[model samples]
Target: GATAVSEWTEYKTADGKTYYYNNRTLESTWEKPQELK
Candidate 1:
C-alpha cells in the first residue's frame, strides 16, 4: 500500500540529489515515493 504523503518527507543531499524519508517506518531512499506524485 502507498504510504500517506504526510508520512514522507523530502530532503536534499550535499550533491543536490533529492531523497525521501518515511517517518512511520524510519526508512530512507533515493527514489521518489509514489505518494509524492
Candidate 2:
C-alpha cells in the first residue's frame, strides 16, 4: 500500500489510457487508486 498520496503518480499512454503508479511499492493499476481520492 502507499504511505502517502505523493507516492502515487498519474500516467497516460499514447492510446489515451489512464493509469496510476506507486513508485514506493512498485505497484500499478488501470483503475483509479483509492489513496488518490
Candidate 3:
C-alpha cells in the first residue's frame, strides 16, 4: 500500500474512453481487478 495526494487525472483509452483517477492517496485500496464502465 502507498499514500499520496488525491487529484483528478485524465486517462484516455484507445477507443477514446476518458477516465478520471482519484489520486487522493498513493495506496491501492483494491485487492482485485474490477470492471470499469
Top candidate when judged by lDDT against the true structure: 1
Q: Candidate 1 — which residues are off by over 4 angstroms? A: none
Output the better candidate (1/2) by lDDT.
Answer: 1
Q: Model 1 residue 9 lDDT? A: 85
Model 3, poorest ten-residue lDDT window? Answer: 27-36
Per-residue lDDT tens digits for candidate 2, residues 1-37, read 4356578889999999979888878888898766677
Model 3: pairs clashing at backbone N, Cα or C within 3 Å: 2-26, 2-27, 3-26, 4-26, 5-23, 6-23, 6-24, 7-23
Per-residue CA lDDT of model 3 for 1-37, tens digit only, reads 3333234455677876666565564333322223233
Give the TM-score comparing model 2 with the true structure, all chains together. 0.63
lDDT of each: 0.83, 0.80, 0.45
Model 1 lDDT on a 0 to 1 scale = 0.83
lDDT for position 6 in model 2: 73
Per-residue lDDT over 1-37 for candidate 1, one digit per residue giving the tens place of the 0 to 100 score: 5565668888999999989998888999998777787
Prediction-by-prediction clash tally: 0, 0, 8
Residue 14, model 3: Cα distance from true site in angstroms = 0.9
Residue 28 lDDT in candidate 1 = 95
lDDT of 1 at 18: 85
